[PDB]
Amino acid sequence: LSAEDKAAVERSKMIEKQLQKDKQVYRATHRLLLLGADNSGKSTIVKQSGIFETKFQVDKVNFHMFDVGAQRDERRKWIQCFNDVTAIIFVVDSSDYNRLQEALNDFKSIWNNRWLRTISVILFLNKQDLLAEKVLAGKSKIEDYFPEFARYTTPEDATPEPGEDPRVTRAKYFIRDEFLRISTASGDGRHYCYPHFTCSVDTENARRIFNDCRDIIQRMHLRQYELL
Amino acid sequence: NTASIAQARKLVEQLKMEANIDRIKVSKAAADLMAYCEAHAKEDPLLTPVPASENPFR
C-alpha cells in the first residue's frame, strides 16, 4: 500500500460503517407477503406503478407489507425471491358464495410449492357484514353450492358471537373447516395455517398479526434449539 | 381481431424470411472454432498456468 491508496481504505471503512448502521434497521424489520384477488377487502386493509408498500407501527415493532398490482396469471416466475419472507397473508372474500373454489385452488398451489415450503400462511376473512344478511336470507342458500351442508355439526370448540343464530356460526365454521381441510393433509414440518376472523373496519388486526408472528418466531426458535 | 391478424401476418413474414438464410456446413464452423481455440491458447492464463511474476493477482 503506497502513499496513494489510503484514502480509498478510509472511504471503504466509512462505507462499512454505513452498512453496519443499516443492519440495525434491516435485521429488526419483519416483512410479509400480502396475496389476494379482486372483489376482496384489499382497499380497506391497505388504507390503515409496480410493487406497492405500506408502513405501520405495531407494539414498537416495525412491520412491512408488500402487495403487487401488475401480477399476470403466471405466479411462479417471481416467487423465487420470496423465500426470505417471514409469513404470508392470504385474503379471501367469503361474502359472495361463488368465486370460492378458485381461492381454495390458489391456497393449495401456494401451500404445496417446494421452494417456499418453510413459510407459514396467515389466513384471513373479510366482509363479515355481507355474510350476515346472506345466510338469513333464503335466496343464496349454501346447500345448493356445497351439498355437504346437510352433514355438518358445529364443532364443540366454538366461540359464538352473542345474538347469532346457529346458521351463521354454522356457515362461519363451514368456511373455516373447508379452509383447514387442505392444510392438514400436507405440511407436518415448520409451517402451519392460522385461521383468523376479524371484521373490516377494526383495529384489533395488529394484535392478530402480532400474536401470529410471535407464535411463529417462538416455535421456530424452540425448534432450532433442539428442544422439539 | 385486426391486431391478431397483423401479428399473424408479421410472424408469417418472419417465418418466410427465415427460409432465406445462408447455410454452411457445421464442420467449417467447428474448424473455425478449433482454429480460434488453438491460436488463442498462449495468451490466456486459465488453461495454461502462468508464473507468479506476470500475475497481478499473485
Partner: protein
C-alpha cells in the same frame, strides 16, 4: 382461419428440421478428440469479498477489468476495485428490490432494474456532486429481468411482458419493440458486433434479434425447460444457454442447432449462470447444487470443481482480460478466483 394457419405452419418447420438434419454432418465430440485435455485445475481463491447485506443476484465487469458491480435484496448498488478489496461508491435507489446489474463500456453509466417496472440509470461521474439519478425509463407492464449496454445513448432490456425493447437515452422513447415471444423472457446477452443479439425465455426457445430493423433473424430449438441465463462467444458465432433441466447447451449462431449436451448423471440441479472466456477452450457455469462448476467446451469432460460457497450461486462472470473469475451466491458472499 386459425386452424388453416396452424395446419399450414407445420411443413415449413418440418423442412427447417430436415435442413438442420441435412446440415448436421458431425459433432464436436466426433472431430475434436486428438487435442490434449486441459487436465486437472487447482483454482484456489485468494480474495473473498464480504460485506453484502443479503443475498445477491447479479454482477458485471467493467472495461478496465478493475471495477465490478453487485446488488442485493436490500437495495444497494456498490462498485468495488477487486485489487485493494475496497468499495468506491454505494448507490441506494428507490426500488427496494432489484434484479439487474449493468456497466457501460465507457465506465460512466450503471443500469439497475428489477420488478418495479422502472429502469434507473446513474451518472457516476457527475460535474459537481455525488451520485444522482439521470433518466428514469418505463413503459413495460412486466418485470424487468436483465439488460446489457450497447452504446452510451441506447440500451436494450428484457422485461416480464414476454417481449423485448430497446430505449434511447435521448427522448427516452421506445423506438422498435421486439415481439414474438410467448413465454416470459428472463435472459439476454449482447454480442461484440453491434448488430445482432439473442434472448431466451421460459418457452424453452431462443430468438436472434436485430438492433436496427427490430426483426427476428433466427430462432433456436427447444431446451426442455425455462431458460435462465445466456452468454455469447467472443468470436460472435456461438452462444451457450442454461435451464433447470441440468443440461447446458452450446448452440452456434451460424449453426443454430444443438451440438453439446452437458449432461452428468450425478447432477440434478439446474443451471443458474453461464459465461465464457477469451480462449473459448473453457466454460464456467454456476450450479444449483450449492457450488460452482467448470466445463471444458471442446471436450465434454469435467475439469475439476469450484466449491466453497455456503449457499447456492446466483451469478457468474469472467473479466475481459480472462485472468480472474468471480461468482456470486445467495449467502451474501462474493468469491473471486484468480
Amino acid at each position: 382461419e386459425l386452424d388453416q394457419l396452424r395446419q399450414e405452419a407445420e411443413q415449413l418447420k418440418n423442412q427447417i428440421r430436415d435442413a438442420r438434419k441435412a446440415c448436421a454432418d458431425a459433432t464436436l465430440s466426433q472431430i475434436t478428440n486428438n487435442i490434449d485435455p486441459v487436465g486437472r485445475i487447482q483454482m484456489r481463491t485468494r480474495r473473498t469479498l464480504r460485506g453484502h447485506l443479503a443475498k445477491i443476484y447479479a454482477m458485471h465487469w467493467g472495461t478496465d477489468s478493475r471495477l465490478l458491480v453487485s446488488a442485493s435484496q436490500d437495495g444497494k448498488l456498490i462498485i468495488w476495485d477487486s485489487y485493494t478489496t475496497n468499495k468506491v461508491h454505494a448507490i441506494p435507489l428507490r426500488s427496494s428490490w432489484v434484479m439487474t446489474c449493468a456497466y457501460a463500456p465507457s465506465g460512466n453509466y450503471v443500469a439497475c432494474g428489477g420488478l418495479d417496472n422502472i429502469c434507473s440509470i446513474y451518472n457516476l461521474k457527475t460535474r459537481e456532486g455525488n451520485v444522482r439519478v439521470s433518466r428514469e425509463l418505463a413503459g413495460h407492464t412486466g418485470y424487468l429481468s436483465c439488460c446489457r449496454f450497447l452504446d452510451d445513448n441506447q440500451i436494450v432490456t428484457s422485461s416480464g411482458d414476454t417481449t423485448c425493447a430497446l430505449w434511447d437515452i435521448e427522448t427516452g422513447q421506445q423506438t422498435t419493440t421486439f415481439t414474438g415471444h410467448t413465454g416470459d423472457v428472463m435472459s439476454l446477452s449482447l454480442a461484440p458486433d453491434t448488430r445482432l443479439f439473442v434472448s431466451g425465455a421460459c418457452d424453452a426457445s431462443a430468438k436472434l434479434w436485430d438492433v436496427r430493423e427490430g426483426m427476428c433473424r433466427q430462432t433456436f430449438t427447444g431446451h426442455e425447460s425455462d431458460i435462465n441465463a445466456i452468454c455469447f462467444f467472443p468470436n460472435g458465432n456461438a452462444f451457450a444457454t442454461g435451464s433447470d433441466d441440468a443440461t447446458c447447451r452450446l448452440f452456434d449462431l451460424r449453426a443454430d442447432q444443438e451440438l453439446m449436451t452437458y449432461s452428468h448423471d450425478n447432477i440434478i440441479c439446474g443451471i443458474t449462470s453461464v459465461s465464457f472466456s477469451k480462449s473459448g477452450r473453457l466454460l464456467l457455469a454456476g450450479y444449483d447444487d450449492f457450488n460452482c462448476n467448470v466445463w471444458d467446451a471442446l471436450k465434454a469432460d469435467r475439469a475439476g470443481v469450484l466449491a466453497g460457497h455456503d449457499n447456492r450461486v446466483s451469478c457468474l462472470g469472467v473479466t475481459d482480460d480472462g485472468m480472474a473469475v468471480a461468482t456470486g451466491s445467495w449467502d451474501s458472499f462474493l468469491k473471486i478466483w484468480n
